[PDB]
Structure 1
Amino acid sequence: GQSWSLSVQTLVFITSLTFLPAILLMMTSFTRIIIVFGLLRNALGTPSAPPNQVLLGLALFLTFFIMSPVIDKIYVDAYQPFSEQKISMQEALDKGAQPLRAFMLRQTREADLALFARLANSGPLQGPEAVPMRILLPAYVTSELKTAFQIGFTIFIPFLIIDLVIASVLMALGMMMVPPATIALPFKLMLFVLVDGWQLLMGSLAQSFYS
């Protein structure tokens, strides 16, 4: 097949270097991670206690570790033929996107993609392995931001229970105008650090992403 000239190959590569770090990271890989981290920070009872830069760096590292396998697959299948000039850029794009599309489709829901297809008026697909990139992304994004909320709620529940029980016992013992939050916050923090909330939570999130 025809091959694009180098002058336009560098142009398209540099242009892709604008979108790929921003959007392909924001709405593809760790949006759920940052959402649940923010929710956990809120639930800890001390908002903005961990540095935002530290949280973002840790989230990025966990994201890289999570997507290491698919990154390796696309890396070999794209670069190595491209490095040896085996394939052209046009076919290399699709060949690299195929495993990424498969991984993205592995995690999404069904009703979201059905609704999106019905909205887009696309013809029915008898085979699941035919969703275009136009229709794949929004379904994955909405599935991710749907599961993030329930994971965050599950994280929230124990701290809510602790706050409720401490407020109830304080008011039963007779302290009405005593702010429970300023008293329960050390207890919530101790529970979290003693049960190892950070390491266990990130491990559980990684396992959930794997399965």
Structure 2
Amino acid sequence: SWSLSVQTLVFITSLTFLPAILLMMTSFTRIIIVFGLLRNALGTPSAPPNQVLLGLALFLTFFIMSPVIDKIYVDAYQPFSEQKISMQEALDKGAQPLRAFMLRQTREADLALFARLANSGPLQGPEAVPMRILLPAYVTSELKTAFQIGFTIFIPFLIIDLVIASVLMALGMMMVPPATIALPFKLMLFVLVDGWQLLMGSLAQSF
């Protein structure tokens, strides 16, 4: 254990990187990109405010991190009080669930690329991946996953738009823009199937 004043300095300094922790280490990027792509899908880039989407992504991130938060509480929050383990060793033990999660959600190709970017040859085991190699690989994997989910969301709305345009063309209309007609049908399909709750359920299942 080192000095209390140094501990305060380090704690307040690490408090600054909270957006970095939320974005790079948790899943927040995935939900935020999925929400952005879904908003782009419905054809209305300002229908729900950016604030509301950010808060919804924050709540989803909190739930989906609740198991990792519980593991942190068991391994770090509690034993730091009983003083069986404390300080930097307890900090590393508490960060261990974050690795496990980020190893689970990271693809092998990104980790391989970032290892050969750091000349880390003897990285043989999969539970001893350094943070420098694990973090950007995890972010890239999250970007790929979010884009895939966005395309899957895109498919039904694209189908509806194409169907509306095809019926307009077949009915004889050649000048009517299909977007105006298809927008309320997109909304009625989204509400009627209750798209939002199934979307959140799938995102939670998507881990």
Q: TM-score, normalised by structure 2?
A: 0.95
Q: 1:93: Cα distance to partner?
A: 1.7
1:86 and 1:202 mapped to 2: Cα distance?
40
Q: 1:147: Cα distance to partner?
A: 1.0
Cα-to-partner distance string for 1:61-96 (whole Å, 9 max, x where unaligned): 111011101111112211212223333321122111
2:188 and 2:170 mapped to 1: Cα distance?
23
What is the total number of aligned residue pairs between the two structures?
Answer: 207
Q: 1:145: Cα distance to partner?
A: 0.1
CA contact 2:42–2:183 (8 Å) conserved in 1: yes
1:22 and 1:120 mapped to 2: Cα distance?
22
CA contact 1:166–1:184 (8 Å) conserved in 2: yes
CA contact 1:32–1:148 (8 Å) conserved in 2: yes
CA contact 1:73–1:99 (8 Å) conserved in 2: yes
1:197 correspondence with 2:200: no
Q: What SS does the corresponding residue of 1:198 show, helix, strand or coil?
A: helix
Q: 1:126 to 1:26 in 2, by over 3 A?
A: closer
Q: What SS does the corresponding residue of 1:120 show, helix, strand or coil?
A: coil
1:24 equivalent among 16, 22, 25:
22
Q: 1:58: Cα distance to partner?
A: 1.2
2:65 and 2:25 mapped to 1: Cα distance?
14
Q: 1:18 to 1:120 in 2, by over 3 A?
A: same
Matched residue, 2:128: 130
Q: 1:26: Cα distance to partner?
A: 5.2
Q: What SS does the corresponding residue of 1:175 show, helix, strand or coil?
A: coil
CA contact 2:26–2:61 (8 Å) conserved in 1: no
CA contact 1:36–1:149 (8 Å) conserved in 2: yes
Q: TM-score, normalised by structure 1?
A: 0.93
2:22 and 2:184 mapped to 1: Cα distance?
39
1:14 equivalent among 9, 12, 16:
12
Matched residue, 2:175: 177
Q: What SS does the corresponding residue of 2:117 show, helix, strand or coil?
A: helix
1:150 and 1:49 mapped to 2: Cα distance?
23
Q: 1:147 to 1:97 in 2, by over 3 A?
A: same
Q: 1:98 to 1:27 in 2, by over 3 A?
A: closer
Of the structure 1 ranges 16-25 and 164-173, higher mean CA displacement relative to structure 2 is found in 16-25
CA contact 1:32–1:144 (8 Å) conserved in 2: yes
Unaligned runs of 5+ in 2: none
CA RMSD of aligned residues (A): 1.3
% of aligned pairs identical? 100
Q: 1:21: Cα distance to partner?
A: 4.1
Q: 1:80 to 1:100 in 2, by over 3 A?
A: same
CA contact 2:24–2:139 (8 Å) conserved in 1: no
Q: 1:189: Cα distance to partner?
A: 0.5
Q: 1:20 to 1:76 in 2, by over 3 A?
A: farther
Unaligned runs of 5+ in 1: none
CA contact 1:28–1:141 (8 Å) conserved in 2: no
Of the structure 1 ranges 170-179 and 23-32, higher mean CA displacement relative to structure 2 is found in 23-32
CA contact 2:161–2:178 (8 Å) conserved in 1: yes
Cα-to-partner distance string for 1:34-67 (whole Å, 9 max, x where unaligned): 0010100110122210121111111111110111
